[PDB]
């Protein structure tokens with residue numbers, strides 16, 4: 642179990658819970674057809690009304706930790722339980738207002754992921770563990786400036802040999818992309834992008850040879 646609960650933007654740490662809708666617990670989302678798949682559920686109130694300014698091309702860290710509290714000292718399951726092999730993914734969706742409560746009907750484009758490297762037997766979850774929960778990626782430099790949600794997700798495939806079984810740990814950050822250009826990428830629906838037939842979601846980690854994370858191809862400029 643893990644929770645995304647804070648951001649760093651071009652090396653500036655914004656603070657615990659700032660600009661993130663933090664779920665109350667590290668319990669997983671398990672239903673890919675639920676609206677909970679979009680941004681999780683049961684947010685800590687009052688939800689942050691900070692919308693982080695991030696230049697297009699900027700480096701963001703989405704910070705995962707074992708619990709909703711963030712860093713609370715040594716913990717062998719922080720940032721995640723390293724037995725829980727699986728991918729890490731990040732998506733953006735353009736939104737009218739990054740503080741708006743309704744997150745349905747948005748169009749999500751993937752900007753980064755890390756799946757599995759067969760030759761090293763290393764998962765994205767392993768890299769996220771090594772890096773202290775710091776899921777680090779750049780915002781595409783060509784994007785249309787304005788308000789976006791930043792959906793960052795750790796999937797545990799430990800029990801994913803059937804569906805349901807995959808455990809989805811995710812939150813949405815609230816950002817305002819500055820600078821940039823005029824690209825408005827094609828996105829996918831949540832729910833909808835993930836299905837029970839996706840081998841990225843139904844996988845036996847002790848039978849894995851090759852692996853492809855679920856959802857669309859990564860967008861690039």
Ligand SMILES: *[C@@H]1O[C@H](CO)[C@@H](O[C@@H]2O[C@H](CO)[C@@H](O)[C@H](O)[C@H]2NC(C)=O)[C@H](O)[C@H]1NC(C)=O
Nearest residue numbers: 648649652653654656702704771772773774775
């Ligand atoms: C993950 O990112 C965090 C947050 O930036 C790093 O913590 C900071 O480390 C810097 C550089 O040493 C310090 O100046 C900050 O005060 C730290 N921030 C906080 C909130 O404590 C952390 O080192 C990174 N972890 C790894 C493995 O890279």
Ligand SMILES: *[C@H]1O[C@H](CO)[C@@H](O)[C@H](O)[C@@H]1O
Nearest residue numbers: 651652698699700701779
């Ligand atoms: C944000 O910062 C990283 C270094 O942490 C760069 O690699 C990236 O290009 C962006 O400038």
